Design a protein around this motif. Structure first.
Motif, PDB file in Angstrom:
ATOM      1  N   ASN A   1      -2.235   3.187 -15.894  1.00  0.00           N
ATOM      2  CA  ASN A   1      -1.389   2.839 -14.752  1.00  0.00           C
ATOM      3  C   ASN A   1      -0.359   1.785 -15.113  1.00  0.00           C
ATOM      4  OD1 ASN A   1      -4.466   2.911 -12.794  1.00  0.00           O
ATOM      5  ND2 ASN A   1      -2.955   4.529 -12.871  1.00  0.00           N
TER       6      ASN A   1
ATOM      7  N   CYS B   1       0.805  -1.230   0.000  1.00  0.00           N
ATOM      8  CA  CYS B   1       0.000   0.000   0.000  1.00  0.00           C
ATOM      9  C   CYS B   1       0.837   1.279   0.000  1.00  0.00           C
ATOM     10  CB  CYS B   1      -1.018  -0.006   1.137  1.00  0.00           C
ATOM     11  SG  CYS B   1      -2.428  -1.111   0.863  1.00  0.00           S
ATOM     12  N   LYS B   2       1.911   1.310   0.806  1.00  0.00           N
ATOM     13  CA  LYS B   2       2.788   2.476   0.950  1.00  0.00           C
ATOM     14  C   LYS B   2       3.781   2.712  -0.204  1.00  0.00           C
ATOM     15  CE  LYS B   2       4.086   2.724   5.480  1.00  0.00           C
ATOM     16  NZ  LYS B   2       4.964   1.545   5.235  1.00  0.00           N
ATOM     17  N   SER B   3       4.123   1.652  -0.966  1.00  0.00           N
ATOM     18  CA  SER B   3       5.006   1.785  -2.117  1.00  0.00           C
ATOM     19  C   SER B   3       4.130   1.935  -3.352  1.00  0.00           C
ATOM     20  CB  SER B   3       5.922   0.573  -2.242  1.00  0.00           C
ATOM     21  OG  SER B   3       5.200  -0.585  -2.628  1.00  0.00           O
ATOM     22  N   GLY B   4       4.139   3.118  -3.968  1.00  0.00           N
ATOM     23  CA  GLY B   4       3.326   3.433  -5.145  1.00  0.00           C
ATOM     24  C   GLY B   4       3.637   2.658  -6.418  1.00  0.00           C
ATOM     25  N   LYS B   5       4.174   1.426  -6.262  1.00  0.00           N
ATOM     26  CA  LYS B   5       4.562   0.492  -7.322  1.00  0.00           C
ATOM     27  C   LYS B   5       3.446  -0.495  -7.671  1.00  0.00           C
ATOM     28  CE  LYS B   5       8.740  -1.019  -5.552  1.00  0.00           C
ATOM     29  NZ  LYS B   5       9.335  -1.368  -4.234  1.00  0.00           N
TER      30      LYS B   5
ATOM     31  N   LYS C   1      -5.935   1.698  -6.712  1.00  0.00           N
ATOM     32  CA  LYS C   1      -6.025   1.474  -5.264  1.00  0.00           C
ATOM     33  C   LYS C   1      -7.487   1.705  -4.899  1.00  0.00           C
ATOM     34  CE  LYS C   1      -1.575   2.659  -3.474  1.00  0.00           C
ATOM     35  NZ  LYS C   1      -1.876   1.928  -2.220  1.00  0.00           N
TER      36      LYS C   1
ATOM     37  N   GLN D   1      -8.838   5.372  -4.825  1.00  0.00           N
ATOM     38  CA  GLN D   1      -9.115   5.748  -6.213  1.00  0.00           C
ATOM     39  C   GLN D   1     -10.492   5.513  -6.770  1.00  0.00           C
ATOM     40  OE1 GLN D   1      -5.036   4.437  -7.774  1.00  0.00           O
ATOM     41  NE2 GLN D   1      -5.349   6.487  -8.618  1.00  0.00           N
TER      42      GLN D   1
ATOM     43  N   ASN E   1      -1.015  -1.922  -6.447  1.00  0.00           N
ATOM     44  CA  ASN E   1      -2.291  -1.792  -5.746  1.00  0.00           C
ATOM     45  C   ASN E   1      -2.621  -3.070  -4.963  1.00  0.00           C
ATOM     46  OD1 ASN E   1      -2.711  -3.349  -8.138  1.00  0.00           O
ATOM     47  ND2 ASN E   1      -4.868  -2.720  -8.276  1.00  0.00           N
TER      48      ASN E   1
END
Ligand SMILES: NC(=O)c1ccc[n+]([C@@H]2O[C@H](COP(=O)([O-])OP(=O)(O)OC[C@H]3O[C@@H](n4cnc5c(N)ncnc54)[C@H](O)[C@@H]3O)[C@@H](O)[C@H]2O)c1
Ligand SMILES: NC(=O)c1ccc[n+]([C@@H]2O[C@H](COP(=O)([O-])OP(=O)(O)OC[C@H]3O[C@@H](n4cnc5c(N)ncnc54)[C@H](O)[C@@H]3O)[C@@H](O)[C@H]2O)c1
Ligand SMILES: [Zn+2]
Ligand SMILES: [Zn+2]
Ligand SMILES: [Zn+2]
Ligand SMILES: [Zn+2]
Lengths: 379, 379
Positions: A188, A105-109, A326, A330, A111
Motif C-alpha cells: 500500500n 475514509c472517503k479519499s482512498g489516499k 483500512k 480490510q 487509512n
C-alpha cells in the motif's frame, strides 16, 4: 449474554505506573454506551508499542491503564445504535478506526480516520468522555482505544473488524497490528514493483512481514539488516535473501548497502523505531527513485535528519501507519487471505502463554529472543 | 566559422575567489574535443545558484571559475563524433545532461543522468579531464558543465538542447534552469491534481514558476509565503491567490498555514534553500496525503529535520532537480510551448544589462529588487 446491561467484574493486567510489572487485578467493566462494543478478549499478543508506553518514553501515556492492542475475541454486547456487529460475532479490535464517512475514509489516499482520536488519545470513550474500567470506583485509562490486556474491553464500533468465525482467534489476534503493518508498508505505502531491490532494517515481527510482503510483490533481492546475527537464519523462510550485521562493519550501514546494490536499493523499510537507522535507510536508497518507508515508532523528541540533497537527487521519504490498511474494510480480507493460505500468520508466533504469564512474556520481549507471544486470557 | 579548430580569445566574467567581485577578463577558449560543442553565448541570465556558489556555500564550489548556467546561444563549432547539433544551430546549454543510454536515462523514473558528472562536478571536460578556459596558460574551471558567463563556452554534446531558431535567445535563456524547475516541480515531481491546495515558500523566479505550474495544474488555492511583502503584488499575475508573511506571525508558519487550510495543504514547495523553512513546508502539509517538494538548494553542511511521526502519519518528503525534466528531450518542447504562449517566460525578466554590468546585476539580486536579470554578452 448473561452479562447484558451489567457491570462486568473480570481479570485485567493493569499498568499502575511506568516501568512497574503489570498487576493482574479484578476490574469493573461498565456496559457499552451509544456506538460502543464490549468484547470478550480470548487471546491477546504482545507488542513493542505496549512496552514503549509501559517504559515511560510515551507522551500520550496515562497511568493507571490497561494496555494491549493486538487481540481477537467475541462480542459480548453492543451499545445503542450498533448494528454492524452483534453478540457472538468474532472480531478484531483495531487501534486504527474506520468511520467510513469522513474525508480521510472517503479519499482512498489514506487509512487515517480521526473520528474517535480525541477520546482514544486520552484513555476514554467518546460517548461520555469517561473510561469503562474502574477498581474501587477509581478509573483505569483505556489504551490505543483497545485495552486488550483485560478479559473484557469496551471499544468504539468504528474500531471493530467483524471476522470469519472459523478463524483461529489465537492466531488472527496478530492481524490487528504487526503483520498488516509489514505487509501493507510494501503493498500500500511503497507499492513495490516486481524485480525490486529491497532493504529491510530490523528482523523482528514487522521486518519479517515486510520481507513476506516484498516476496509476494516479487522483489529480486531482500536485504536483511539486524544487529543480532541469530535473527538471520529464521529470516530466510520469510523471503530474506541476504544479511548484514552493522556491528560487523566500520563504515556506515548505508555505504555497505550502496556497495552491494550498484548505487543503493529501490526500497528501504525501517522496522525498529531508531532515528539514526531511519537516516541510514533513506541514504541507502538509490539516486533518482529510491524510496524509504519508516514503519518503526520512534520515542518522543527524537527527530530524523538528512542533507536535503538526498531528496533533490530523487530519494523519497515516507512512512506507514498499520500498513495503510483500512481496519473494518480490510482486516476481514486479511483474515480470509490467511484462511485461504495466501498469507502467513502462525509463523510469527514463537510462544503461547496465559494472562498470569504477562510479565514473563514482557521479559522475553526485552531479551529479543521471540517473535510474537500470544496470551490465552481465559485459561 | 572563422574560428573553427582555433583557440578563441574572448571576454568572460571570472570568479577568482569566493565572495570577491567578478572580474571581466580576456580568456582563451580551446576548440571542442570529441563529443563537445563550442557555443557563442548570446544571452545569459543570473540565477541564485550562481550567487550560491560565489558566496562560498557550495560543497562543489571550485575557484577560479567561470560561473553561469542559464543561457541561449548559437553553436560556433563541434568536436569529433558530434552529429545532433552543427554550426549555426540555436541551443540552450543545460546543467542537467541527458546521454539517453544510461541506467538513469532509460529508467523512466528520473532525469538525473550521471554520464559527465565525474568531469563537470570537478570543473573539467570528460575527453581529457582538463578545462577549456585559461588565462596566461593557467586553467579556469568550468561550472555546472555550462560556464555561461563567457562569450564562448565549451559543453558536452549530451548537455546541449537544440531549439527552434525563431525563438528569442534573450527570453529562452531562462529555459535552461529556473522556469522549468518551478513548472516541473509541479507537473513531474509532485504531479499536482486539479483542486489541490498549494503552499509556495519563497516568491522569487522559482516560486513564481511553481505558482504558474500549479495554476496550469488547476489548483484551487495557491498560498504564497515570503518574508518580503513587496514580492506579493507581482505574484498575483503568476497565480498566487493568497499571501502570508512569516514575520507578521508569532506562531510557526506551518501552524499559520494549517489553521487556514483545515489541517494543511495538499502540496508544499520550498523555493528558497533554507533548512528551517524546508521543515516548516513539510509540517504545513495535510496529514495522510500531504507532499512537500524541496526545490531550494541548501548551503553545505545544512541538514533538514522533522519528527518521524510526520511521515508515519502520511506526509511525503521529496525534492526536484531541474523540475524532473529531461534536458535534450524536453527543453525544445518547452521552447515550443512558450512560442505557443502556453507558458510564460518574458514575465520573469525584470532587467536586461550587459556583461560589463555583471556585478551591478548581482547587487540588484542581493537587494531582492528583481526577478531574472538577462545579460547581453556581445553589446
Ligand atoms: N507504524 C506502525 O503502524 C507500527 C505498527 C506495529 C509496530 N510498529 C513498530 O515497529 C517496530 C518493530 O516491531 P517488532 O515487533 O518487529 O519489534 P522487534 O523488537 O521484534 O524488532 C526490532 C528488531 O530490530 C533490531 N535492531 C535493533 N536496533 C537495530 C539497529 N540499530 N540496526 C539494525 N537492527 C536493529 C532488533 O535486533 C530486532 O530484531 C517497533 O518500533 C514498533 O513500535 C509500528
Ligand atoms: N532544485 C533545482 O533544480 C533548482 C534549480 C533552480 C534553482 N534552484 C533554487 O531555487 C532557490 C530560489 O531560486 P530563485 O532564483 O527563485 O531565488 P530568489 O532569491 O529570487 O527567491 C527566494 C525568495 O525567498 C524569500 N525568502 C527568503 N527567506 C525566506 C523565509 N524564511 N520564508 C519565506 N520566504 C523567504 C525571499 O524573499 C525571496 O523572494 C535557490 O535556492 C536556487 O538555488 C533549484
Ligand atoms: Zn502492536
Ligand atoms: Zn473516518
Ligand atoms: Zn544518461
Ligand atoms: Zn539556475
Amino acid at each position: 449474554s448473561a452479562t447484558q446491561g451489567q457491570v462486568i467484574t473480570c481479570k485485567a493486567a493493569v499498568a499502575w505506573e511506568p516501568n512497574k510489572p503489570l498487576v493482574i487485578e479484578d476490574v469493573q467493566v461498565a456496559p457499552p454506551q451509544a456506538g460502543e462494543v464490549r468484547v470478550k478478549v480470548l487471546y491477546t499478543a504482545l507488542c513493542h508499542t505496549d512496552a514503549y508506553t509501559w517504559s515511560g518514553k510515551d507522551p500520550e501515556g496515562l497511568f493507571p491503564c490497561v494496555l494491549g492492542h493486538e487481540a481477537a475475541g467475541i462480542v459480548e454486547s453492543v451499545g445503542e445504535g450498533v448494528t454492524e456487529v452483534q453478540p457472538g460475532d468474532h472480531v478484531i479490535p483495531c487501534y486504527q478506526a474506520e468511520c467510513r464517512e469522513c474525508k480521510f475514509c472517503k479519499s482512498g489516499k489514506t487509512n487515517l480516520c480521526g473520528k474517535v482520536r480525541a477520546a482514544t488519545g486520552v484513555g476514554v470513550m467518546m460517548n461520555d468522555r469517561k473510561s469503562r474500567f474502574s477498581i474501587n470506583g477509581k478509573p483505569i485509562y483505556h489504551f490505543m482505544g483497545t485495552s486488550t490486556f483485560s478479559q473484557y474491553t469496551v471499544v468504539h464500533d468504528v474500531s471493530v473488524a467483524k471476522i470469519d468465525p472459523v478463524a483461529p482467534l489465537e492466531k488472527v489476534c496478530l492481524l490487528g497490528c504487526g503483520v498488516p503493518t509489514g505487509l501493507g508498508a510494501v503493498w500500500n505505502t511503497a507499492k513495490v514493483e516486481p524485480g525490486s531491490i529491497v532493504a529491510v532494517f530490523g528482523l523482528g515481527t514487522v521486518g519479517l512481514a515486510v520481507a513476506e510482503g516484498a516476496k509476494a510483490a516479487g522483489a529480486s533481492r531482500i536485504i536483511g539488516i539486524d544487529i543480532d546475527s541469530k535473527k538471520f537464519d529464521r529470516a530466510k523462510n520469510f523471503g530474506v535473501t541476504e544479511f548484514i550485521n552493522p556491528k560487523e562493519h566500520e563504515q556506515p550501514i548505508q555505504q555497505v548497502i550502496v556497495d552491494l546494490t550498484d548505487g543503493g536499493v529501490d526500497y528501504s523499510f525501517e522496522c525498529i523505531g531508531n532515528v539514526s537507522v531511519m537516516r541510514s535507510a533513506l541514504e541507502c536508497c538509490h539516486k533518482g527513485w529510491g524510496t524509504s518507508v519508516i514503519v518503526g515508532v520512534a520515542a518522543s523528541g527524537q527527530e530524523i535528519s538528512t542533507r536535503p540533497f538526498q531528496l533533490v537527487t530523487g530519494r523519497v521519504w515516507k512512512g506507514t501507519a498499520f500498513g495503510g490498511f483500512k481496519s473494518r474494510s480490510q482486516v476481514p480480507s486479511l483474515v480470509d487471505k490467511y484462511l485461504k493460505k495466501e498469507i502467513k500468520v502462525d509463523e510469527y508466533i514463537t510462544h503461547n502463554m496465559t494472562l498470569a504469564d504477562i510479565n514473563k512474556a514482557f521479559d522475553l520481549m526485552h531479551d529479543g529472543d521471540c517473535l510474537r507471544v500470544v496470551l490465552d486470557m481465559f485459561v
